Design a protein around this ligand. Structure first.
Ligand code: CYC
Ligand code: CYC
Ligand code: PEB
Ligand code: PEB
Ligand code: PEB
Ligand code: PEB
Ligand code: PEB
Ligand code: PEB
Ligand code: PEB
Ligand code: PEB
Ligand code: PEB
Ligand code: PEB
Ligand code: CYC
Ligand code: PEB
Lengths: 162, 57, 164, 177, 172, 324, 172, 164
């Protein structure tokens, strides 16, 4: 994964180098910001069910055809409603994985690589997932540099869908 | 059997040694499968090869 | 058996060699425990009929279905065979303290108990309910010494682990 | 194979040196805290069967897709092997705690385990979670801080024996990763 | 390659779980160990030419068959590769110190090194001797309190010594 | 000598020459008193087979005096000698206690039975006896089942048979024989796939994957490869070995496809000259031109002759070419 | 790769023979079914996305452990590789329909596909029921007459269903 | 590396069992005997340069035929190796006191020693001439404890019984 520690090793192994002060300062910047990152991942984990059911309802108010239109792509059956709240939980879980690691590395490996062929094949549209992630950005209840850390990985997921 | 025709060389940067122990930020990032990369890092080899042969566009 | 003498002699016999210096430090560790282990065998030898009386009906108080028609405690006669079935395992714990190792348990009480208790439809979970009661009823200075209750309880967890 | 005293000798035989007095101070405190080590192995072996049936049940309740048809704990033959795949890990750790060296699980258990597990299709990230639960149960018995069972020891401190056994469980996870 | 923070994330995704509060609080303890970890790595990288050269010179003192005519280390090209191989391993052990786990020591250094040395005829047991002489040359340097606040960091020197044992049993 | 067509024979030039000569058949029930010069040959032939060309010093042998005495009395080769010898300490030291459990099963198949465990069920049939009954009944299961009695006699030494068609195993277990038994001047400690410390056929013995056969003594007898899976489910790394399939459009373009294995790749001997380069000897990352020896390739037919010249003119030597 | 024409030619050069008159006739018979063969390949190609994406959706509905976390098609990297594999099998079957013999399907798609899924950990019996679903979805879709002149076309969909049956047995 | 720990672990490993109570009682003697056994180990570490001179010189008093041409002690570079061939043996006795058992002697000194002492024509009665002189040139009040000169003397005539 792309973490701040494996991208300092890889730039030092590329130059055939021991770990200089260029690389020790970079790992030290991870350890400074990890105090605000590990409380954002603890506060998003503990309030996750409030955020998943909320963010799935925010898609249904905004795009109400997804509950009325028949077909397997839409949240009109009880099966297709549980697969929606499944997917909101997948996106929220990857955001907490990026806060504990630092850097958009877990969702670059588990989520965004091959995502366009999934949305194209099963006829899912990425504007349903932007609306769900814009709810979580506005409703996680964090503040300060703890909200600054969480919102920086919400906006990475939106920029890959937008 | 028609060999290739002879042309003359020219002075270029790569024909001559750089002394360059401990390279810097302009060292240009070897992407190799000799470092045994995982699945997330073989995606970066593939994007680097697309950038080099095709354009970024 | 499996004890401290039978282990260093067999490993001497399985290598064709005389009793070495490390073969004698082990018996030295049997001298430093016999005076802390044979008084656990002394207490159990004179108090067993009150131990199996209350540990035997702690399983019938737990699993009360056994006194049904078609079960393992159908009549009074098959209840008395279970008290005899329990007063063997306390007798073999007494023999493991005397020998020092767990040889008498896993050669007369454990070996073949899976095939027997599956065939005759005897639940092993009621055996370990009668042995876990004894392990918890023990008080350390009241019933034994401070380290005699470590030896006696170390064999009641060999019985429970071997029947599970 | 190599215990705490054989580890000292093979490092002196590399230099062809005599084992003097400055190197016997690590071995004079190995013996001085010898009853605490035997009080530590006794707290693992006495409830080792309960330690395994809680660790792989706790692995399944977290990952319920292991027992689905196609999972790696689906059949009765596969779940029975997992129940001893993790009972033989706890066995070789208690050999290593008894001997004060890791040269028996790294020579009879950990060698070539990662090649064995991906030949069979065993998910290693769940095999580490089963071992990780047993490490939490092990330090809760060395130190007398188990919730459902207190044992009878003398008074004192065993935070060096608790962290030694937690370093024996971490090289199991570092071997299949 | 992975660090210690992504090792616990790759294991939570494989079961589809959020990280529990115990795994978070065990990760924040690794963060406050972070200044003591950067001291150990700085202490090795600033003595790196003397870790290699002294433990090389101490190796051909007790094993003079390596540099005797016909030995594996006898010529300038083979002496230069023995010093490169000592520097490579000490480089990738210090990489696995800032990471916290040995995933970078395993793949891009140690995977296929017993197979490489057996192909060339390098005595792989003598390589394990040289790795264990750079171990106690740098375990002794991380226990040096010169220019540090005197606290306790005995748990990371027992970690750094384990990466040297990992590389030494992997070439024999 | 190597080859398969010279002496109109092919198995004695794979390292099985001296094994194809001996019987060691023990033509009488008990040993005749007054003499020892005939049964000492039977004793030592049993030692070189059951221990697998291992060295046993005369003090190590003198531990096993009792046994050698009962076999010279009125007792038999399989049950009183080969079963007693495998329960000594000189056996358990090298083949049991140094290895994991599957290293012990693979060496008891090689030593006692003379063949290879093919498939996971030959391992599992012998693994389950150890978990319930310990070591001393785990050795019995290699003897007191229905394989030993129908193949070897009561008084013949258990010769090698895992290569021939009578041992009805597989053809993948044919190739696994020439990984275990690498010639006659070799032992179990002295071959580079098991150094008395590991499992020789771990991934290939479980999955029944056939191996390329490399003859002992050939130029390329030092070929050895390390193991890593690939694919993200098993969390593996790409770039170590070559594939064994040749699957895509590169399968049938450029002709049919082969799998080539190289071994000897040193740092001098790359360029189009005869001598090593002089100068810095390494690039700035100072790895190597070939970061590991023993590279393997997947190549079509129309690119086989340019690849062959790239292999040999840069120092490498070809260990095996199999068609894919 | 060979078609039905060059297969018969390649078996004659090995003997050094001309083609007999009974083989020119059997090769001229499949020319007369030329338009009927191109109608089948055009039907499978025109519905290529709907053959795959319905068979996959019907596959994870009955085997839901392939997509629940830790399954072999759980991540969007692995899930897009599963959908890629289903339309490699579909693409090489319709190549074999145009040619007339399974040589392109047998060489560059099927030879070594069982060993590939075994070595990765992919359940090969689940790839068989993913191929069987696309057979029934494309022999029912080559059996409707909308757009085609109604003649008889049953000797060729028994061949097309024979290529799907060849692919589903060489994945286990 | 045979000792008291590696023999009760190999006994438990070859049965597939956990360490029983016998395996823990074999270590309480290893704890007890360690003080006598480690006390002689440090008395031999800081005195080996003078014992080796005294022991090797007792060889060349019973055996003066070694000094002749053609025999094993012909020149001073070969007389020096006999002092080294003895100083090797006192190190392996020092290792057997630190370990506890007779592990390093039969692994590093006795294994294959009869082949080397037959091809090179080294007499073996002059190897036992040195160790047997050390074993009875000994004061258990002065040089050691009373119970350290029984553990030190045991490994010496173990070496004599091996070489004879
Ligand atoms: C629903 C499908 C089932 C499934 C598919 C699956 N396959 C892979 C990985 C690979 N598949 C191939 C096969 C080919 N590659 C080709 O180029 C061609 C053309 C000739 C074929 C036939 C290969 C080579 C791989 C490995 C390379 C890669 O990973 O891309 C995967 C990913 C497995 C992994 O962990 O990497 C999946 C998920 N698996 C299922 O679960 C379904 C049953
Ligand atoms: C907000 C809910 C909206 C919605 C959801 C919906 N999604 C699906 C199906 C899939 N979604 C995925 C996505 C992922 N899988 C992954 O592993 C990851 C990374 C961790 C992601 C992002 C996939 C693979 C599928 C198909 C398989 C499956 O999971 O069942 C469906 C079902 C579509 C179908 O044809 O079955 C729905 C209904 N759709 C809505 O209408 C909501 C607005
Ligand atoms: C009869 C054989 C002898 C004799 C024997 C006595 N030995 C006595 C004590 C004793 N011996 C040892 C060493 C022994 N114990 C061990 O654990 C080991 C090795 C592992 C050995 C070799 C010890 C430790 C002791 C205890 C006292 C001590 O030495 O500190 C002994 C005393 C017992 C008593 O008096 O009640 C006797 C009589 N002595 C003899 O006179 C005959 C010839
Ligand atoms: C930390 C792990 C524990 C704890 C350990 C202590 N144990 C102490 C003493 C002790 N334990 C035993 C039994 C043990 N020795 C054996 O030989 C055998 C069986 C063969 C066993 C199970 C003994 C005999 C002793 C010594 C007591 C005595 O004198 O008889 C101990 C105190 C001694 C010391 O520390 O030196 C401690 C601290 N105690 C704890 O509180 C934690 C939970
Ligand atoms: C069989 C599975 C179908 C079916 C096939 C028939 N097609 C018949 C005639 C026909 N087909 C085509 C189209 C074909 N030629 C091309 O050049 C191209 C692409 C550019 C395609 C797709 C043409 C042009 C013709 C006319 C030539 C002719 O008359 O043969 C046909 C013959 C009619 C009959 O005898 O029944 C059949 C059977 N028709 C079906 O009903 C099933 C569904
Ligand atoms: C008691 C609370 C149990 C229970 C016990 C019963 N056991 C019965 C028979 C039986 N038990 C044993 C094992 C025992 N006998 C021995 O001789 C020794 C060791 C020396 C032991 C541990 C055996 C071998 C047998 C069969 C021979 C015999 O009957 O003595 C039994 C009679 C059942 C029957 O035969 O129908 C009972 C009722 N049953 C319970 O209800 C709880 C679980
Ligand atoms: C449960 C915790 C796991 C899991 C376990 C499975 N293990 C399976 C097979 C297996 N495991 C081993 C290693 C084991 N043998 C040893 O000797 C040692 C260490 C000394 C260990 C850890 C081997 C060699 C095998 C091969 C098969 C055999 O001999 O039994 C297994 C496969 C059973 C089967 O395929 O039928 C399972 C399911 N797998 C899991 O999913 C959880 C995470
Ligand atoms: C451990 C084996 C060492 C040792 C480590 C300690 N360092 C402590 C504090 C500390 N260290 C640094 C320097 C470090 N941080 C960086 O960002 C960089 C590079 C740019 C480096 C080299 C700083 C800035 C601090 C202060 C911050 C803090 O308190 O964490 C420390 C704490 C003191 C104590 O409790 O003992 C320790 C232990 N010190 C040692 O004694 C050994 C030799
Ligand atoms: C002495 C001149 C050498 C040297 C020799 C060593 N050889 C060792 C082990 C060994 N050697 C062989 C080959 C030998 N056996 C045969 O059957 C044949 C020919 C038909 C030959 C040449 C084997 C099979 C073994 C393995 C013995 C075993 O595994 O038990 C060896 C190590 C012995 C050990 O580790 O116990 C040595 C030291 N070494 C030297 O340095 C000089 C050059
Ligand atoms: C010497 C003081 C005796 C004497 C000894 C002889 N024994 C001879 C042969 C022999 N002895 C045994 C028994 C031995 N093997 C065992 O397993 C055990 C105990 C477990 C013992 C005591 C056997 C089985 C044999 C058979 C021959 C063999 O093993 O090869 C023997 C003759 C040797 C020969 O015939 O070549 C002798 C001389 N005989 C004496 O006259 C004095 C009293
Ligand atoms: C004849 C039409 C062929 C041909 C045949 C040869 N086969 C030779 C040896 C041999 N073949 C096999 C494979 C066979 N045995 C099996 O067990 C199985 C599968 C169950 C099969 C297919 C084996 C294992 C062997 C080794 C010898 C043995 O097992 O006894 C062979 C050489 C004999 C020799 O080396 O002296 C030949 C000539 N070769 C031909 O030229 C035509 C095409
Ligand atoms: C002194 C009491 C003897 C004597 C000794 C000589 N030994 C000679 C060579 C030699 N010795 C050994 C065994 C030694 N090497 C070890 O590594 C160990 C244990 C760790 C021991 C005990 C070996 C293997 C060798 C041969 C190697 C070499 O030559 O250096 C020796 C030289 C004889 C020669 O090779 O010409 C002597 C003179 N000789 C005496 O006079 C008394 C009997
Ligand atoms: C020195 C203490 C010991 C020793 C070393 C020695 N090594 C080599 C040769 C090679 N070492 C490697 C290893 C790597 N190359 C890499 O790029 C990496 C990073 C992934 C590693 C770990 C390789 C590939 C070679 C061969 C290429 C080369 O020759 O440089 C030699 C030279 C052997 C030769 O004959 O060329 C030597 C001498 N040898 C000793 O004796 C010491 C014990
Ligand atoms: C899905 C089902 C499910 C379970 C079964 C439990 C399983 C479980 N138990 C513990 C944790 C533990 N488990 C034990 C085990 C035992 N205590 C005893 O008294 C007995 C001897 C033995 C059980 C038979 C001990 C001693 C601890 C640590 C202290 C404690 O939590 O009690 C942990 C550690 C947490 C971790 O680090 O991962 C887990 C997962 N939890 C679950 O979610």
């Amino acid at each position: 994964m792309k973490t701040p520690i494996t991208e300092a090793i890889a730039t030092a192994d590329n130059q055939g180098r021991f770990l200089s002060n260029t690389e020790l300062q970079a790992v030290n910047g991870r350890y400074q910001r990890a105090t605000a990152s590990l409380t954002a991942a603890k506060a998003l984990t503990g309030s996750a069910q409030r955020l998943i059911t909320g963010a799935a309802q925010a898609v249904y108010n905004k795009f109400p055809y997804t509950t009325q239109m028949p077909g397997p792509a839409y949240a009109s059956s009880a099966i297709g409603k549980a697969k929606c709240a499944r997917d909101i939980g997948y996106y929220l879980r990857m955001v907490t994985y990026c806060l504990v690691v630092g850097g958009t590395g877990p969702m670059d490996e588990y989520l965004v690589a091959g995502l366009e062929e999934i949305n194209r094949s099963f006829d899912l549209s990425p504007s349903w997932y932007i609306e769900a992630l814009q709810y979580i950005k506005n409703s996680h209840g964090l503040s300060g540099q703890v909200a600054n850390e969480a919102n920086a990985y919400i906006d990475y997921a939106i920029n890959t869908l937008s | 059997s028609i060999p290739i025709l002879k042309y003359s060389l020219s002075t270029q940067n790569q024909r001559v040694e750089s002394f360059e122990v401990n390279p810097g930020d302009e060292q240009y990032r070897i992407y190799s499968t000799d470092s045994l990369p995982s699945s997330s890092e073989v995606d970066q080899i593939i994007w680097a090869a697309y950038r080099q042969i095709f354009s970024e566009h | 058996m499996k004890s401290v003498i039978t282990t260093v002699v067999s490993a001497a016999d399985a290598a064709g060699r005389f009793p070495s210096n490390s073969d004698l430090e082990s018996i030295q560790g049997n001298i430093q425990r016999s005076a802390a282990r044979l008084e656990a065998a002394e207490k159990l030898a004179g108090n067993h009929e009150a131990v199996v009386k209350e540990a035997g009906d702690a399983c019938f108080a737990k699993y009360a279905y056994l006194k049904n028609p078609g079960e393992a405690g159908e009549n009074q006669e098959k209840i008395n065979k279970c008290y005899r079935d329990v007063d063997h395992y306390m007798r073999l714990v007494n023999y493991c303290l005397v020998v020092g190792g767990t040889g008498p348990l896993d050669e007369w009480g454990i070996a073949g108990a899976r095939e027997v208790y599956r065939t005759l439809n005897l639940p092993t979970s009621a055996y370990v309910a009668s042995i876990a009661y004894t392990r918890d009823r023990l008080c350390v200075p009241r019933d034994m010494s401070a380290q005699a209750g470590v030896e006696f309880s170390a064999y009641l967890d060999y019985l429970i682990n071997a029947l599970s | 194979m190599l215990d705490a005293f054989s580890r000292v000798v093979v490092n002196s035989d590399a230099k062809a040196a005599y084992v003097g007095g400055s190197d016997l101070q690590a071995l004079k405190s190995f013996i001085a805290d010898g009853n605490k080590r035997l009080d530590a192995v006794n707290s693992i072996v006495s409830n080792a069967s309960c330690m395994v049936s809680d660790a792989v049940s706790g692995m399944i309740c977290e990952n319920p897709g292991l027992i689905s048809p196609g999972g790696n704990c689906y059949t009765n033959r596969r779940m029975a092997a997992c129940l001893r795949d993790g009972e033989i890990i706890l066995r070789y750790v208690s050999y290593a705690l008894l001997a004060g060296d890791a040269s028996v699980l790294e020579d009879r258990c950990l060698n070539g385990l990662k090649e064995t597990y991906i030949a069979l299709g065993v998910p290693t990230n769940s095999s580490i979670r089963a071992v990780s639960i047993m490490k939490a149960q092990a330090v809760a018995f060395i130190t007398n801080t188990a919730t459902e069972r207190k044992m009878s020891f003398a008074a004192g401190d065993c935070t060096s024996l608790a962290s030694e056994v937690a370093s024996y469980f971490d090289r199991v996870g570092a071997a299949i990763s | 390659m992975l660090d210690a923070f992504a090792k616990v994330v790759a294991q939570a995704d494989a079961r589809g779980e959020f990280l529990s509060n115990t795994q978070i609080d065990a990760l924040s303890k690794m963060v406050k160990e972070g200044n003591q970890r950067l001291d150990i790595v700085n202490k090795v990288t600033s003595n790196a030419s003397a870790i290699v050269t002294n433990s090389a010179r101490a190796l051909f003192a007790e094993q003079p068959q390596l540099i005797q005519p016909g030995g594996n280390a006898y010529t300038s090209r083979r002496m230069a590769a023995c010093l490169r191989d000592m520097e490579i391993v000490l480089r990738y052990v210090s990489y696995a110190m800032i990471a916290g786990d040995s995933s970078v020591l395993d793949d891009r250094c140690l995977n296929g090194l017993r197979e490489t040395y057996q192909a060339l005829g390098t005595p792989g047991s003598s390589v394990a001797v040289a790795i264990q002489k750079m171990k106690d040359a740098s375990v002794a340097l991380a226990n040096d309190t010169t220019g540090t606040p005197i606290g306790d960091c005995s748990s990371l020197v027992a970690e750094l010594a384990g990466y040297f044992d990992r590389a030494a049993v992997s070439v024999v | 000598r190597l080859g398969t067509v010279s002496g109109n024979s092919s198995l004695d030039k794979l390292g099985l020459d001296k094994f194809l000569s001996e019987s060691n058949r023990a033509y009488t029930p008990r040993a005749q008193p007054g003499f020892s010069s005939e049964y000492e040959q039977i004793i030592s032939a049993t030692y070189k087979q059951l221990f697998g060309n291992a060295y046993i010093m005369d003090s190590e042998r003198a531990e096993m005096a009792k046994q050698e005495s009962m076999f010279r009395d009125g007792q038999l080769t399989l049950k009183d000698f080969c079963r007693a010898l495998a329960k000594t300490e000189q056996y358990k030291k090298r083949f049991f206690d140094s290895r994991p459990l599957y290293g012990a099963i693979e060496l008891n198949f090689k030593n006692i039975l003379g063949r290879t465990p093919d498939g996971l069920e030959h391992y599992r049939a012998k693994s389950a006896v150890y978990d319930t009954k310990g070591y001393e009944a785990f050795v019995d299961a290699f003897f007191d089942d229905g394989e030993y009695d129908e193949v070897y006699d009561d008084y013949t030494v258990p010769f090698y048979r895992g290569y021939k068609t009578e041992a009805n195993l597989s053809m993948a277990a044919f190739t696994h024989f020439f990984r275990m038994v690498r010639g006659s001047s070799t032992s179990d400690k002295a071959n580079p796939n098991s150094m008395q410390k590991d499992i020789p056929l771990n991934y290939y013995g479980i999955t029944k994957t056939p191996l390329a056969v490399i003859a002992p003594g050939a130029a390329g007898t030092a070929y050895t490869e390390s193991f890593a899976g690939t694919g993200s489910w098993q969390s593996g790394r790409a770039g170590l070995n070559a594939a064994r399939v040749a699957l895509g459009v590169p399968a049938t373009a450029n002709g049919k496809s082969f799998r080539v294995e190289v071994t000897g790749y040193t740092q001098p001997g790359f360029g189009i000259t005869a001598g090593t380069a002089v100068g810095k000897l390494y690039k700035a990352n100072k790895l190597s031109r070939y970061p590991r020896s023993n590279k393997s390739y997947v190549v079509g037919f129309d690119e086989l002759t340019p690849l062959y010249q790239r292999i040999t003119k840069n120092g490498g030597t070809i260990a095996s070419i199999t068609p894919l």
